[PDB]
C-alpha cells in the first residue's frame, strides 16, 4: 500500500482532538470490523458533532452518553462511500471498542492499530471498501503479521456470523481477498 511522510497515504487526515492512554500491553495487530460512527470527520448529522463539541444529550442510550465523558480516538475509519479517513497515526495509542476477544486473547480495550468501518443505518457500503481495506490490510499484515488470521469485531468474540449489531461485510468475500491462510511467508 502507499505510505506518504510515514503517514498512511490516500487517506483524509483527521487527527483526533484528544487521544487516550490505557494501562495494557499486547502487540498491536488486530483487525476490527464493525459499522460505527462516532467522530465528525465529514457528515451533516448533528449528533456526531455534538459528541466532539460536548453538547451531546443522554437520549440515544446509556453506553454512548456514558462514554462521551471519556474522549474517543479510533485509528483508520473507512466511510461507507469507499473513503479512507485516518484518526490517530501509529504514534500515541487510541481507544474505540470497549472489549473484544479472539483465539484465547482478550483485549481489555481497543489497544491495537487496526481499522474500523463507518456507515449510517446500513447506507450502501460500496464493495470498494472491502477491496481498498484488503489492500491496507496487506500492508498492515506485512508490517505486523497477526491480522492475516485475526479478524473480529465486538460481537465476533466467538460466533463469526455476527460481528456487531449489523455485520453484513461478506466474510467469504473478505477472507478470500485477504491472506487465505496461504500467500504469506515467515509467520
Among 160, 164, 175, 177, binds Zn ion (CB under 5 A): 164
For 69, 109, 134, the CA distances from 117, given in Å and listed in that order, are 23, 18, 12
Residue 95 DSSP SS3: strand
Give the separation between CA 12 and CA 92, rounded to whole angstroms. 18
Number of H helices, E strands in the chain: 4, 11
Does position 75 interact with Zn ion (CB under 5 A)? The reply is: no
Q: Which of 13-21, 22-30, 59-67, 150-158 is the region at the interface with Zn ion (rule: CB under 5 A)?
A: 150-158
From candidates 30, 31, 34, 132, binder to Zn ion by CB under 5 A = 34
> In the 8-state DSSP scheme, what is residue 35?
E
Q: Between residues 34 and 80, which has the closer beta carbon with respect to Zn ion?
A: 34
In the complex, least distance from residue 34 CB atom to Zn ion, rounded to whole angstroms:
4
Q: Cα(135)–Cα(64) distance, rounded to whole angstroms?
A: 31
Count of residues binding Zn ion (CB under 5 A)? 3
Binding residue for Zn ion, selected from 115, 154, 156, 178, defined by CB under 5 A: 154
Query: Which candidate in 116, 118, 160, 185 is catalytic?
Result: 116
Q: 33 CB contacts (<8 Å, ≥6 apart)?
A: 115, 117, 151, 152, 153, 156, 163, 164, 167, 169, 174
10 in catalytic set: no
Residues that bind Zn ion (CB under 5 A): 34, 154, 164
- Catalogue the active-site residues: 116
Amino acid at each position: 500500500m502507499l505510505l506518504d511522510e510515514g503517514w498512511l497515504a490516500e487517506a483524509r487526515r483527521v487527527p483526533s482532538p484528544h487521544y487516550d492512554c490505557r494501562p495494557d500491553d499486547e502487540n498491536p495487530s488486530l483487525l476490527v470490523v464493525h459499522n460505527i460512527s462516532l467522530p465528525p470527520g465529514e457528515f451533516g448529522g448533528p449528533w456526531i458533532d455534538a459528541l466532539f463539541t460536548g453538547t451531546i444529550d443522554p437520549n440515544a442510550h446509556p453506553y454512548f452518553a456514558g462514554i462521551a465523558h471519556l474522549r474517543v480516538s479510533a485509528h483508520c475509519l473507512i466511510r461507507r462511500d469507499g473513503e479512507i479517513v485516518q484518526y490517530v497515526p501509529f504514534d500515541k495509542r487510541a481507544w474505540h471498542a470497549g472489549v473484544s476477544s479472539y483465539q484465547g486473547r482478550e483485549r481489555c480495550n481497543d489497544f491495537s492499530i487496526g481499522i474500523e468501518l463507518e456507515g449510517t443505518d446500513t447506507l450502501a457500503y460500496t464493495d470498494a471498501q472491502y477491496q481498498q481495506l484488503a489492500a491496507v490490510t496487506n500492508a498492515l499484515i506485512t508490517r505486523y503479521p497477526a491480522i492475516a488470521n485475526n479478524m473480529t469485531g465486538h460481537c465476533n468474540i466467538a460466533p463469526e456470523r455476527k460481528t456487531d449489531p449489523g455485520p453484513s461485510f461478506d466474510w467469504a468475500r473478505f477472507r478470500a481477498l485477504v491472506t487465505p491462510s496461504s500467500h504469506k511467508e515467515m509467520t
